[PDB]
Design an enzyme around this catalytic site. Structure first.
Site, PDB file in Angstrom:
ATOM      1  CG  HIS A  70      -1.831   1.187   1.196  1.00 10.49           C
ATOM      2  ND1 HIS A  70      -1.638   2.495   1.276  1.00 10.49           N
ATOM      3  CD2 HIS A  70      -3.125   1.281   1.122  1.00 10.49           C
ATOM      4  CE1 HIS A  70      -2.537   3.229   1.233  1.00 10.49           C
ATOM      5  NE2 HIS A  70      -3.623   2.360   1.329  1.00 10.49           N
ATOM      6  CD  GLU A  84      11.310   7.789  -5.319  1.00 15.29           C
ATOM      7  OE1 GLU A  84      10.938   8.347  -6.416  1.00 15.29           O
ATOM      8  OE2 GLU A  84      12.302   7.908  -4.935  1.00 15.29           O
ATOM      9  CG  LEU A 107      -4.254  -8.256   5.339  1.00 13.63           C
ATOM     10  CD1 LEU A 107      -4.594  -7.722   6.603  1.00 13.63           C
ATOM     11  CD2 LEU A 107      -3.909  -9.940   5.728  1.00 13.63           C
ATOM     12  CB  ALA A 108      -9.399  -8.120   1.682  1.00  8.59           C
ATOM     13  CG  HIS A 109      -9.398  -9.058  -4.298  1.00  6.31           C
ATOM     14  ND1 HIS A 109      -8.624  -8.330  -5.467  1.00  6.31           N
ATOM     15  CD2 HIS A 109      -9.479 -10.169  -4.460  1.00  6.31           C
ATOM     16  CE1 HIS A 109      -8.061  -9.464  -5.939  1.00  6.31           C
ATOM     17  NE2 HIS A 109      -8.771 -10.344  -5.638  1.00  6.31           N
ATOM     18  N   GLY A 110     -10.269  -5.064  -2.801  1.00  5.60           N
ATOM     19  CA  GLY A 110     -10.672  -3.801  -2.592  1.00  5.60           C
ATOM     20  C   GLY A 110     -10.388  -2.822  -3.611  1.00  5.60           C
ATOM     21  CB  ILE A 111     -10.894   0.942  -4.052  1.00 12.26           C
ATOM     22  CG1 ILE A 111     -12.209   0.858  -3.677  1.00 12.26           C
ATOM     23  CG2 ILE A 111     -10.672   2.017  -5.203  1.00 12.26           C
ATOM     24  CD1 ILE A 111     -12.550   1.041  -2.164  1.00 12.26           C
TER      25      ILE A 111
HETATM   26  C1  LIG Z   1      -9.268   4.621  -0.592  1.00 11.82           C
HETATM   27  C2  LIG Z   1      -9.691   4.304   0.875  1.00 11.82           C
HETATM   28  C3  LIG Z   1     -11.279   4.024   0.840  1.00 11.82           C
HETATM   29  C4  LIG Z   1     -11.960   3.601  -0.495  1.00 11.82           C
HETATM   30  O1  LIG Z   1     -11.746   4.231  -1.498  1.00 11.82           O
HETATM   31  O2  LIG Z   1     -12.828   2.745  -0.359  1.00 11.82           O
HETATM   32  C5  LIG Z   1      -9.202   3.339   1.665  1.00 11.82           C
HETATM   33  C6  LIG Z   1      -9.216   2.341   1.752  1.00 11.82           C
HETATM   34  C7  LIG Z   1      -8.108   1.198   2.046  1.00 11.82           C
HETATM   35  N1  LIG Z   1      -7.047   1.322   2.545  1.00 11.82           N
HETATM   36  C8  LIG Z   1      -6.611   0.242   3.028  1.00 11.82           C
HETATM   37  C9  LIG Z   1      -5.478   0.105   3.617  1.00 11.82           C
HETATM   38  C10 LIG Z   1      -4.558   1.274   4.047  1.00 11.82           C
HETATM   39  N2  LIG Z   1      -4.962   2.443   3.872  1.00 11.82           N
HETATM   40  C11 LIG Z   1      -3.871   3.088   4.367  1.00 11.82           C
HETATM   41  C12 LIG Z   1      -3.829   4.537   4.679  1.00 11.82           C
HETATM   42  C13 LIG Z   1      -4.843   5.391   3.996  1.00 11.82           C
HETATM   43  N3  LIG Z   1      -5.610   4.965   3.277  1.00 11.82           N
HETATM   44  C14 LIG Z   1      -6.265   5.949   3.112  1.00 11.82           C
HETATM   45  C15 LIG Z   1      -7.458   6.240   2.469  1.00 11.82           C
HETATM   46  C16 LIG Z   1      -8.423   4.975   2.430  1.00 11.82           C
HETATM   47  N4  LIG Z   1      -8.209   3.928   2.314  1.00 11.82           N
HETATM   48  C17 LIG Z   1      -9.682   5.588   1.926  1.00 11.82           C
HETATM   49  C18 LIG Z   1      -9.504   6.862   0.913  1.00 11.82           C
HETATM   50  C19 LIG Z   1     -10.913   7.871   1.637  1.00 11.82           C
HETATM   51  C20 LIG Z   1     -11.014   8.828   0.895  1.00 11.82           C
HETATM   52  O3  LIG Z   1      -9.849   9.572   0.453  1.00 11.82           O
HETATM   53  O4  LIG Z   1     -11.981   9.343   0.039  1.00 11.82           O
HETATM   54  C21 LIG Z   1      -5.457   7.301   3.185  1.00 11.82           C
HETATM   55  C22 LIG Z   1      -4.757   7.538   1.834  1.00 11.82           C
HETATM   56  C23 LIG Z   1      -6.395   8.376   3.998  1.00 11.82           C
HETATM   57  C24 LIG Z   1      -6.720   9.629   2.997  1.00 11.82           C
HETATM   58  O5  LIG Z   1      -5.595  10.224   2.644  1.00 11.82           O
HETATM   59  O6  LIG Z   1      -7.695  10.146   3.067  1.00 11.82           O
HETATM   60  C25 LIG Z   1      -4.604   6.861   4.221  1.00 11.82           C
HETATM   61  C26 LIG Z   1      -3.117   7.242   4.156  1.00 11.82           C
HETATM   62  C27 LIG Z   1      -2.975   8.726   4.735  1.00 11.82           C
HETATM   63  C28 LIG Z   1      -3.532   8.982   6.248  1.00 11.82           C
HETATM   64  O7  LIG Z   1      -4.757   8.896   6.583  1.00 11.82           O
HETATM   65  O8  LIG Z   1      -2.699   9.502   6.928  1.00 11.82           O
HETATM   66  C29 LIG Z   1      -2.708   2.211   4.907  1.00 11.82           C
HETATM   67  C30 LIG Z   1      -1.224   2.432   5.649  1.00 11.82           C
HETATM   68  C31 LIG Z   1      -1.384   3.323   6.984  1.00 11.82           C
HETATM   69  O9  LIG Z   1      -2.490   2.958   7.424  1.00 11.82           O
HETATM   70  O10 LIG Z   1      -0.576   4.041   7.371  1.00 11.82           O
HETATM   71  C32 LIG Z   1      -2.954   0.903   4.696  1.00 11.82           C
HETATM   72  C33 LIG Z   1      -2.288  -0.400   4.899  1.00 11.82           C
HETATM   73  C34 LIG Z   1      -2.746  -1.104   6.280  1.00 11.82           C
HETATM   74  C35 LIG Z   1      -2.300  -2.545   6.211  1.00 11.82           C
HETATM   75  O11 LIG Z   1      -0.833  -2.487   6.480  1.00 11.82           O
HETATM   76  O12 LIG Z   1      -2.790  -3.732   5.930  1.00 11.82           O
HETATM   77  C36 LIG Z   1      -7.403  -1.145   2.753  1.00 11.82           C
HETATM   78  C37 LIG Z   1      -7.222  -2.547   3.004  1.00 11.82           C
HETATM   79  C38 LIG Z   1      -5.973  -3.041   2.228  1.00 11.82           C
HETATM   80  C39 LIG Z   1      -5.756  -4.625   2.698  1.00 11.82           C
HETATM   81  O13 LIG Z   1      -6.796  -5.287   2.406  1.00 11.82           O
HETATM   82  O14 LIG Z   1      -4.809  -5.165   3.241  1.00 11.82           O
HETATM   83  C40 LIG Z   1      -8.650  -0.443   2.045  1.00 11.82           C
HETATM   84  C41 LIG Z   1      -9.796  -0.966   1.551  1.00 11.82           C
HETATM   85  C42 LIG Z   1      -9.737  -1.299  -0.099  1.00 11.82           C
HETATM   86  O15 LIG Z   1      -8.574  -0.910  -0.518  1.00 11.82           O
HETATM   87  O16 LIG Z   1     -10.911  -1.024  -0.529  1.00 11.82           O
END
Ligand SMILES: C[C@@]1(CC(=O)O)c2cc3[nH]c(cc4nc(cc5[nH]c(cc(n2)[C@H]1CCC(=O)O)[C@@](C)(CC(=O)O)[C@@H]5CCC(=O)O)C(CC(=O)O)=C4CCC(=O)O)c(CCC(=O)O)c3CC(=O)O
Lengths: 119, 119
Positions: free
Chosen positions: A9, A45, A70-74
């Protein structure tokens, strides 16, 4: 001939990248693949296109991309297949093989159980 | 006395929740914990506070929370410890035990290797 690209990610924290780097070292230690690269979807990077290109430049025709999620998703169904241009820079005679994420694998329940007891 | 709460990210797609549900069934099938509940951080039910409360209501004094995430990051170090009120609710006499994520575990490299070959 074949390369393993592990894709994670990425975070603003460093732990995500560290994880992919550790995982790649461990697969290197198993001596299974000629070439092994890593790529992070966001914030870090190397990026996915970067890792893919780096594998071609080392002479890989078949690129195995495993999404370390871990899972499928966006991320796994839109973003990654996009960045791999699989749905809309790849030489015509190179195939990307996009693999499956981790899923609800029994080994994951083993890990969860250990983690539950602080092991 | 002790409950296992598995906590995952959650998704606008259903796959994330399906994963946690499958994982929880598999831990149920091992008959290790009196009580086993799941919670999703975002966009899905049940939520983390929901799962935690459901465990108390079944008579748990010690709640083992395992974050089913690959690495540490914002979710595991801010959001979740918040929603568990560990940073900023819960009966005085109940302890939340917040466990560690999956990490770069050898079994994860086994899984990656299988996934690389379509297994
Ligand atoms: C797109 C979104 C929702 C959507 O679009 O459905 C979504 C979806 C998912 N994220 C997943 C994983 C992680 N996401 C992060 C981090 C962030 N994810 C963010 C946003 C969002 N995450 C929603 C955007 C909402 C919007 O912007 O409208 C950020 C960018 C937030 C932001 O910037 O707003 C933020 C970083 C910045 C910050 O918050 O500081 C980390 C790393 C970490 O936690 O540091 C992990 C690894 C965790 C691990 O290590 O396992 C999984 C499951 C993956 C799996 O299955 O493994 C899904 C489910 C999927 O992929 O569907």
């Amino acid at each position: 001939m074949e390369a393993l690209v592990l894709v994670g990610h990425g975070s603003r924290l460093p732990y995500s990248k560290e994880l992919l780097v550790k995982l790649a070292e461990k697969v290197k230690e198993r001596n299974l693949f000629p070439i092994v690269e890593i790529g992070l979807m966001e914030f870090s990077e190397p990026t996915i296109p970067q890792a893919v290109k780096k594998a071609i430049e080392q002479g890989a025709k078949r690129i195995i991309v495993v999404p370390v999620f871990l899972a499928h998703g966006i991320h796994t169904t839109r973003d990654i297949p996009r960045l791999l241009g699989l749905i809309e820079e790849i030489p015509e005679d190179v195939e990307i093989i996009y693999r499956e994420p981790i899923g609800a694998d029994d080994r994951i329940v083993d890990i969860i159980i250990d983690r539950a007891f602080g092991r």
